[PDB]
């Protein structure tokens, strides 16, 4: 009956709270200090948490979820029926846990070295090279080097990882791991929805792509850029060419409308990692939202350690399942990019604090895309020239188009990349792409979606997906695609909630209590209701929609079409088989 159901849920929540808190401590200890000792402890704590998952998960499966009255209790028990990795037999589980840790450690300690010289780490060294160098061969060195050292080293683990994660998925009632991952959205038409959203943003991407390709042609020379072909993947200012904002100087629509160098400003004016997170905190509280607790500042790792110890540098936010302990771990560099990243991570923390009073089983975003979007929404307002000037980091129509271009280089360029990652992965999980086709199929999608080509031919042993954090880390990626669509939807709604009129891209929601209240009511729901409810509460409607993003960039689309047509650009890459002759 209903009495036995709510009793079970209560017991589950009490015990999960304690054991997940213990696991988090062990996880944090490894992530902020990679050693044999901390690795061993984490693997042991994995086994502990799995015994808890198996125990309650087995009990959960005795309940007929669809015979239960209460929909909150229904959602919890259904979720507990999914054991995840704990469904695996003991020895397979320990193998799986070891594989995950080996992949993570391998990625986190990988270096690219000059012969008899310095060894560069991904953050900050190779990131800086990719962002600042305008020398074809130096960029190639970093790009190829990272894939030679990180990508190739991951390959030996990946097939077995795939086999084990699929096995876990099947034992939990899914057909493969991709099926399992997509189900987090509880949206049967997810694939169709995502495809249509991608389609709607093609005109804008193809126009941005063609404009950038022309600018690259001017800088790197006619012998190295085919104006009707894909762009070499090492030229976009980012290791994965996932965001292109670092090549702004090469593409600026109006050089006669120059903007302040934001990095120098931050460095000259004495910005620090701590002050960067404080400014994000200040934006959140200005909306009437919650401040981070005192403990956050005591326990967080907001910069790379100097005692030579190995860490997982990739920015992350941590819920210790206590309602009190929340942390950010980020190897922060003093620049505008990482200020944006800081807001993103603080969005996660805000979400943690908003739903901390829910049962632990419901302490998640409405869907994974929602969790990613929160910080980005506020960052959109932070990014406005108006607001950046108020922070003394920047000093009309030309500047407007300049700004839109700058925003498109991050936001628009990321749409096809964030779509591609899990398109590749779902097909690996479903067996459509085998281990013999891993890399070739990755570059087929890189071409199809992004219009990029590798600068150098790929060889046997290459596993370029391995060189992207989320692949060895086993973190789903489609959430970021969803995030980039919906954050503009959130922006549009919060802007009219704040009374702002005029072009969407000029909106700054700073200090708006009405905008804060709308985000708050949705965030408080956690995972307790289907996501269209949270979507409805923020936006006044229940769908994912590209309309807001299109509206934001409307003036840029018009300007790009004009510019591309007058320069005679072919939109797309008709000569799709072109690769560098170099």
């Amino acid at each position: 009956d209903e009495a036995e159901a709510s009793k079970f849920v209560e017991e589950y929540d009490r015990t999960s709270q304690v054991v997940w808190n213990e696991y988090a401590e062990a996880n944090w200890n490894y992530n902020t200090n990679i050693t044999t000792e901390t690795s061993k402890i984490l693997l042991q704590k994995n086994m502990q948490i799995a015994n808890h998952t198996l125990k309650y998960g087995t009990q959960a499966r005795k309940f007929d979820v669809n015979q239960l009255q209460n929909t909150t209790i229904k959602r919890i028990i259904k979720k507990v029926q999914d054991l995840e990795r704990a469904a695996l037999p003991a020895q397979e589980l320990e193998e799986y846990n070891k594989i995950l840790l080996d992949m993570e450690t391998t990625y986190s300690v990988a270096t690219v070295c000059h012969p008899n010289g310095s060894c560069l780490q991904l953050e900050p060294d190779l990131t800086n090279v990719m962002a600042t160098s305008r020398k074809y061969e130096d960029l190639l060195w970093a790009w190829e080097g990272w894939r030679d050292k990180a990508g190739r080293a991951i390959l030996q683990f990946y097939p077995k990882y795939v086999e084990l994660i699929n096995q876990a998925a099947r034992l939990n009632g899914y057909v493969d791991a991709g099926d399992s991952w997509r189900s987090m959205y509880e949206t049967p038409s997810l694939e169709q929805d995502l495809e249509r959203l991608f389609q709607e943003l093609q005109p804008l991407y193809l126009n941005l792509h063609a404009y950038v390709r022309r600018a690259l042609h001017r800088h790197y020379g006619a012998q190295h850029i085919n104006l009707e072909g894909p762009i070499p993947a090492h030229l976009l200012g980012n290791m994965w060419a996932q965001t292109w904002s670092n090549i702004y100087d090469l593409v600026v629509p109006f050089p006669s409308a120059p903007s302040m160098d934001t990095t120098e400003a931050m460095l000259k004016q004495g910005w620090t990692p701590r002050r960067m997170f404080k400014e994000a905190d200040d934006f959140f509280t200005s909306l009437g939202l919650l401040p981070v607790p005192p403990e956050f500042w005591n326990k967080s790792m907001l910069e790379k350690p100097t005692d030579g110890r190995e860490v997982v540098c990739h920015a992350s936010a941590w819920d210790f399942y206590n309602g009190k302990d929340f942390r950010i771990k980020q190897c922060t560099t003093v620049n505008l990019e990482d200020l944006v990243v800081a807001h993103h991570e603080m969005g996660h923390i805000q979400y943690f604090m908003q739903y901390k009073d829910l049962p632990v089983a419901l302490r998640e975003g409405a869907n994974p895309g929602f969790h990613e979007a929160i910080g980005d929404v506020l960052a959109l307002s932070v990014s406005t020239p108006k607001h950046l000037h108020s922070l003394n980091l920047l000093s009309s129509d030309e500047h407007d188009i300049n700004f839109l271009m700058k925003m498109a280089l991050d936001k628009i360029a990321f749409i096809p990349f964030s779509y591609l990652v899990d398109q590749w992965r779902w097909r690996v999980f479903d067996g459509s792409i085998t281990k013999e086709n891993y890399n070739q199929e990755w570059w087929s999608l890189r071409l199809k979606y992004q219009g990029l080509c590798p600068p150098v031919p790929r060889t046997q042993g290459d596993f370029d997906p391995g060189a992207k954090f989320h692949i060895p880390s086993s973190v789903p990626y489609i959430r970021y695609f969803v995030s980039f669509i919906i954050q503009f939807q959130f922006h549009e709604a919060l802007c009219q909630a704040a009374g702002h009129t005029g072009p969407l891209h000029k909106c700054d929601i700073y200090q708006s209590k009405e905008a804060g209240q709308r985000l708050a009511t949705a965030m408080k729901l956690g995972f307790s209701r289907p996501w269209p409810e949270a979507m409805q509460l923020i936006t006044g409607q229940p769908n994912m929609s590209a309309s807001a993003m299109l509206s934001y960039f409307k003036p840029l689309l018009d300007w790009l079409r004009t510019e591309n047509e007058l320069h005679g650009e072919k939109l797309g890459w008709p000569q799709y088989n072109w690769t560098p002759n170099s």
Partner: peptide
Amino acid sequence: DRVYIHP
């Protein structure tokens, strides 16, 4: 648990 970035 732990939530990242593009990311």
